[PDB]
């Protein structure tokens, strides 16, 4: 009875035509785009009505139905017929929610019926299924049509309606359902898990169930790091005539943001200002790790990648670049993997002893929303159009590497389990790290015996690097100097004797608030990590094309490499040069062209790519 | 709102009055003609096109697309009411006798109507079938993952009463129903006669019913997602159009499955869905003179994989593999090499060219193996056999990469195929035999590194001789540097990357459809050997065995191999008797395959 005042407040807030026109413009954009939820910033609601903002965040359900009714009134005033074209117009909330910013761990029972913004990683999603909200029925015996609304505990009003349809009797006559005139909404359930690094000590990551409706269902898949704004509620699990107090709790989402996914003109100017920007990016790739320049260049090529061809005959040429690092203990292989996991979009960690062929590809699991079993994606399927980092790769079982073979060879994985027979897309770059046999590389043995992997598997990697703990005194001097400098570093936003805090939630707005070189050092103008992330994100899309001169030089130098294999030492060749090496040359030249943002693979790209191949094939 | 009686009258008007000038301007009333055919029972299914409906009422097309089930019923009722105007087996007999009793509309209805979807509607993917499209006519593309056998679905049940001799009828809509027990007729109820009802399967209307499951095309799925699936329920003449592994586009109504009883309270307002299928669509003498040119053998060998230079005699052997010998008959061959030697590329070409084929790895695949496998489909829980590379390749050729890396189960399965061309598999502890007569095209690696000719093939490739001797030809695709050929190969690869196509080769490959026609009519020829050529076979075989003994993988299977290859070349020549050139070709192909191995 009292909610008309709140509805008046929200309608007054939405009618921005008087002062700034922000939200009337947003509603107009909603009408033009044919959407039916408005994205409202609670910061603006605070600026115009602090009282109503506090009430909204602390009394979420009643306030939200008031807000949605006000939005329906406003969109009707702007365009009445469009207001009739949808059952109801939702509102999704963004901005800063104060103390309501939580994780799945800190989302305790005291947050019930409040708007909360939960940050976490998606572990699983149920299949989208329709949900009836209003069913229309027709009586042939009466030539009359009737309607019934439907609600359940998930809906904001939360009354449980009877599940069944009117069936054989209205006016004691048989009805039949008008499915077309009825209206259904999409329904999906996901599970948001705590960020694994932020758990306290030995506690495993906790999780919270989330319910998506209508247009939100597409906006999250497993492995995504998301921020979900919604209302927290308990669902009573009555037996019928009896219940235990234990109720499961869910988050009915009103808005979902991909917090890790995501201006170009300054990048396209920087590629002109800089001289051979590939070198600067490669040097600035992992600042904490000294040396390994060619490996860093190869990793940058892996990050950028070639362009995947589709041929007129329907065959396709795989565009991803696969790198295998083999080397002694303590030569930063694991650290290079960790940097790639931090810097790249959708990079999946994996280690040889802690993974299985099932977990790498797909597993049959029961969806508890229904009980039916479905495929749940493994590591390389999650890594599609991304990277997968495999540490301790020499420690995998052969049956587990059978899974990797198809992924690397064809960019897919074939599955035949449960009721499903399917070719899943697993188009990912593999960055594998391994130790040689006997732990430490043996100079008195051939590379094919230091490398315990089979030649069939090794053929699938574009580049194979052997990196050794050579105890040269000058190299040791520079390495130790860099290591001790890194260990001496302390951040500016940290006191002089602090131990760094164990993880806790520190994100307090749905969008980042502080919105290219490093400033400390003089030599070579090191690039910052954020700019490198943005530049790689832009440069991956350029898609350059071969030129006649670069093609000619690649062919000539490949022929030289092949003919050089005639007299090259069979006892010490890293890997045999073949057409696969030529594919590697083309992909690396394309990646260098992407780094330059050139749109044409030039002779410079060919020169750098074939230099990298020469180093990887004929240098330790 | 809608006045469905007026809609029915407008539908009658459309059916009566539409014409489309078919058969080059004859001004045919297509729907009147089909109404005559339905009335005469010479036709049962009527696919009305909403593109035709659009040409006189777009609003009616919109109403159909928005409320498809209602308008399906209205169109069917209008057609049934109009059949007497155009009316110039067992259920027919029953309808005749019920007309005699008159002298249950759904029972007397002996036709079916479907909407062929309008071209303005784009064909969706399965993932794009949102909840807003429930109860609406949608067009969906996908791969047919699995199809059930055709089963009878009760449409109108018919009962007879023992005491009062009266027929009673029970129309069926839901997937489940209550069968009637006691007689409802007033002469039974008022007399309290205790009469009961017996179902008459003979005099009750069934319909063909088939359940299948579509699945997203793999190259249309979003990046990080499992392909989605949709259950499709198929009725009447739409049944048996689809098969597993087929690519289809289905026009149908997206509807919810309304379960009964305990599942209702469990599921609540949620519901599973199915697609009610209305339409399923599936995605030379001059040429014989070109074939007549005596170059045709080498012309075809050149047309085989111009992307690969050399190995022309291997290409000829591959041609004879696709041709096959006299019916035994499969020319199984094996070609070993190092990784990356263009061996996989050659096998991929044969898989693309061949009409029935498969391409797989000997190892360890997480998919269905070389043998078929039994899936569970746990929403139903009914275990069903599916796939198997050998089974899917049955009448054709199965290509196996890294044959050396096969498991022992796979090796025994291929051994069984080589022996008797069928395999054994268990569904639910019980087991069956499953048929596969495919030719095997095997590619294998050395056990370690590049091939060394100083070591024998079985010791190098690490395969048992019991399997390795089965193949008629053994080739070794060795790769070594060669400056000009490497440069030519590099120019080819660079052009392929630069233009996404093969460069011009100073000749035109024959069309693969024409090659398929050629090998088909070739395989339809059935040669036989004369006795003089048998003597020639004997002399050539004994001399070849002298050479093999002096340098041992020659036996009676060698004589049978050269006979198979000679009959294959006789088929290639398209003549029903072999000749000296056939035996010469077989002998030299075997000899030079051994030379390639040496």
């Amino acid at each position: 009875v009292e909610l008309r005042e709140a509805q008046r407040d929200y309608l007054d807030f939405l009618d921005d035509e008087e002062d700034q026109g922000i939200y009337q413009s947003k509603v107009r954009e909603l009408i033009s785009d044919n959407q039916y939820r408005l994205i409202v910033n609670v910061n603006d609601l605070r600026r115009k009505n602090e009282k109503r903002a506090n009430r909204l965040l602390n009394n979420a359900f009643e306030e939200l139905v008031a807000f949605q009714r006000a939005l329906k009134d406003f969109v009707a005033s702007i365009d009445a017929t469009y207001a009739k074209q949808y059952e109801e117009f939702y509102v999704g909330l963004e901005g800063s929610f104060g103390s309501k910013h939580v994780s799945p761990r800190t989302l305790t029972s005291c947050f019930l019926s409040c708007v909360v913004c939960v940050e976490g990683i998606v572990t699983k999603c149920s299949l989208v299924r329709p949900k009836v909200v209003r069913s229309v029925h027709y009586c042939p015996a009466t030539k009359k049509t009737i309607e019934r609304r439907y609600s359940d505990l998930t809906t904001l009003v939360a009354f449980p309606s009877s599940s069944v349809y009117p069936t054989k009797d209205e006016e004691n006559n048989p009805l039949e359902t008008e499915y077309g005139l009825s209206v259904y909404k999409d329904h999906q359930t996901i599970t948001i898990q705590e960020m694994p690094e932020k758990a306290p000590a030995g506690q495993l990551p906790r999780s919270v169930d989330v319910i998506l409706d209508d247009d939100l269902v597409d906006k999250a898949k497993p492995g995504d790091r998301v921020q979900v704004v919604g209302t927290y509620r308990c669902l009573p699990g009555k037996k019928g005539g009896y219940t235990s107090g234990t109720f499961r709790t869910v988050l009915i989402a009103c808005n979902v943001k991909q917090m890790s996914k995501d201006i170009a003109k300054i990048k396209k100017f920087s590629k002109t200002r800089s001289k051979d920007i590939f070198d600067q990016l490669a040097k600035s790739l992992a600042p904490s790790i000294h040396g390994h320049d060619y490996v860093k260049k190869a990793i940058l090529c892996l990050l950028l990648g070639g362009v995947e061809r589709d041929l007129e005959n329907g065959s396709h040429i795989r565009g991803d670049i696969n790198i295998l690092l083999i080397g002694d203990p303590s030569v930063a292989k694991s650290q290079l993997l960790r940097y790639v996991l931090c810097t790249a979009p959708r990079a999946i960690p994996t280690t040889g002893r802690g993974s299985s062929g099932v977990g790498l590809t797909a597993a049959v699991t029961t969806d508890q929303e229904t009980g039916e079993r479905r495929l749940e994606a493994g590591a390389m399927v999650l890594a599609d159009r991304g990277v997968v980092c495999i540490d301790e790769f020499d420690k995998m079982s052969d049956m587990d590497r059978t899974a990797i073979h198809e992924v690397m060879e064809q960019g897919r994985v074939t599955i035949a389990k449960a009721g499903i027979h399917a070719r899943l897309n697993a188009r990912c770059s593999v960055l594998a790290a391994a130790n040689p046999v006997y732990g430490r590389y043996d100079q008195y043995k051939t590379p094919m015996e230091n490398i315990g992997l089979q030649d069939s598997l090794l053929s699938r990697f574009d580049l194979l690097f052997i990196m050794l703990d050579q105890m040269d005194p000058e190299q040791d001097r520079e390495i130790s100097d860099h290591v001790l400098r890194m260990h001496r570093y302390r951040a500016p936003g940290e006191q002089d004797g602090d131990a760094m805090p164990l993880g806790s939630a520190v994100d307090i707005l749905a969008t980042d608030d502080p919105n290219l070189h490093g400033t400390k050092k003089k030599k070579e103008k090191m690039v910052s990590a954020a700019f490198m992330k943005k530049y790689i994100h832009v440069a991956k899309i350029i898609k350059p094309v071969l030129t006649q001169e670069s093609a000619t030089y690649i062919a000539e130098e490949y022929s030289r490499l092949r003919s050089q294999d005639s007299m090259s030492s069979d006892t010490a060749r890293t890997s045999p040069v073949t057409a696969r090496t030529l594919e590697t040359l083309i992909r690396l030249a394309t990646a260098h062209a992407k780094a330059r943002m050139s749109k044409t693979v030039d002779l410079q790209d060919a020169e750098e790519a074939v230099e990298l191949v020469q180093y990887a094939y004929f240098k330790k | 709102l809608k006045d469905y009686a007026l809609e029915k009258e407008k539908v009658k008007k459309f059916l009566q009055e539409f014409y489309q000038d078919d058969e080059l301007g004859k001004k045919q009333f297509k729907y009147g003609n089909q109404l005559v055919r339905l009335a005469h029972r010479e036709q049962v299914a009527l696919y009305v096109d909403l593109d035709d409906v659009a040409e006189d009422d777009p609003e009616l097309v919109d109403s159909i697309c928005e409320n498809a089930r209602r308008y399906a019923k209205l169109f069917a009722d209008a057609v049934q009411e109009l059949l007497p105007q155009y009316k110039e087996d067992v259920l027919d007999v029953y309808i005749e006798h019920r007309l005699m009793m008159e002298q249950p509309a759904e029972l007397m209805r002996r036709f079916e109507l479907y909407f062929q979807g309008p071209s303005s509607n784009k064909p969706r993917v399965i993932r794009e079938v949102r909840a807003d499209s429930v109860g609406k006519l949608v067009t969906v593309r996908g791969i047919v993952t699995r199809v059930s056998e055709v089963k009878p679905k009760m449409v109108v049940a018919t009962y007879t009463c023992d005491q009062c001799g009266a027929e009673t009828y029970q129309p069926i809509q839901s997937p489940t129903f209550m069968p009637l027990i006691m007689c409802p007729s007033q002469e039974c109820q008022t007399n309290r006669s205790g009469g009961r009802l017996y179902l008459q399967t003979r005099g009750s209307r069934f319909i063909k019913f088939q359940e299948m499951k579509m699945q997203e095309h793999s190259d249309q799925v979003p990046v990080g997602n499992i392909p989605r699936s949709i259950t499709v329920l198929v009725e009447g003449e739409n049944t048996r159009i689809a098969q597993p592994g087929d690519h289809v586009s289905v026009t149908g109504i997206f509807l919810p499955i309304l379960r009964t009883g305990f599942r209702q309270v469990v599921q609540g307002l949620l519901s599973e869905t199915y697609l009610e299928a209305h339409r399923i669509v599936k995605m030379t003498r001059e040429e014989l003179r070109q074939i007549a040119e005596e170059d045709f053998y080498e012309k075809l060998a050149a047309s085989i994989a111009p992307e690969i230079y050399g190995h022309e005699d291997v290409k000829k052997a591959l041609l004879l593999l696709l041709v096959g010998g006299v019916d035994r008959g499969n020319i199984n061959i094996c070609l070993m090499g190092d990784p990356g030697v263009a061996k996989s590329q050659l096998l991929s070409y044969i898989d693309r060219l061949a009409p029935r084929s498969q391409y797989t790895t000997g190892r360890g695949s997480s998919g269905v193996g070389l043998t078929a496998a039994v899936l569970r489909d746990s929403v139903s829980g009914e275990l069903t056999l599916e796939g198997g590379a050998l089974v899917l390749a049955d009448q054709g050729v199965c290509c196996i990469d890294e044959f050396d890396k096969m498991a022992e189960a796979d090796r025994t399965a291929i051994h069984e195929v080589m022996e008797q061309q069928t395999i054994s598999i268990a569904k639910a502890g019980i087991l069956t035999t499953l048929n596969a007569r495919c030719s095997i095209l095997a590619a294998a690696n050395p056990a370690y590194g590049r091939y060394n000719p100083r070591r024998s093939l079985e010791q190098n490739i690490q395969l048992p001789a019991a399997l390795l001797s089965r193949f008629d030809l053994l080739w070794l695709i060795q790769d070594r540097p060669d400056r000009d050929n490497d440069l030519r190969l590099a120019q080819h690869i660079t052009y392929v990357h630069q233009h996404s196509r093969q460069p011009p080769s100073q000749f035109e490959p024959l069309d693969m459809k024409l090659m398929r026609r050629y090998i088909a009519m070739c395989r339809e020829k059935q040669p036989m050997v004369p006795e003089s050529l048998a003597d020639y076979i004997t002399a050539a075989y004994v001399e070849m065995r002298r050479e093999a003994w002096a340098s041992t993988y020659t036996s009676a299977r060698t004589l049978l191999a050269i006979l198979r290859l000679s009959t294959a070349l006789a088929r290639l020549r398209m003549v029903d008797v072999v000749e000296k050139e056939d035996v010469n070709e077989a002998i030299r192909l075997m000899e030079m395959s051994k030379d390639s191995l040496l």
Partner: protein, 227 residues
Amino acid sequence: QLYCDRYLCDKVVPGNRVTIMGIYSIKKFVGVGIRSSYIRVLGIQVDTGAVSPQEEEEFRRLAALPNVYEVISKSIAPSIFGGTDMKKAIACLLFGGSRKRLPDGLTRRGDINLLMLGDPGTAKSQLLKFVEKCSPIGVYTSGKGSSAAGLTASVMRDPSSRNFIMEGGAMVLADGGVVCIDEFDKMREDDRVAIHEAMEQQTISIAKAGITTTLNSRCSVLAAANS
């Protein structure tokens, strides 16, 4: 079975030793007249992190006095004669270095890993049994009694839900503490391989049964072995 309520939730974690004050009672939803029993907790006492100011003054005095290093070394395993340098190494292990997160996001471990190879009957196992007792978080394992899953993490099907769930091994149970692996040489090679990520990167990356995560293993490995 215990039932914790309101502010008793998350007052204790697995591996802790507690005294529980509560009400022994039946659950109230083989045989007929049987009811399952549990304790309704109303008081938790950790028998052994919020220090009192008096304790903080004592700790500051201990840090301030000049011979605290020798005092700690003498305090470690006082029943064990000799081995003073090994006790000093154990002191360094117990206090540990400083974890550091560098500008590019790479993290360096502060934990110190200490192996004690040597002759039998030399108090190595007793030093491990002291460190398990003395460390704020401490887990004692026998190498021969351990497995790769049991050390790092196990994936098992939840019986009541049919999902696959994670279970913390010794290195997860000891996160923020010390793992005492006694008779370390008796492990099979494939099981010693499992701890390589957790010893250096201090993480346990898992990809099994469709669940894919990176658990934390910020712990020190103290190992004992014979020749």
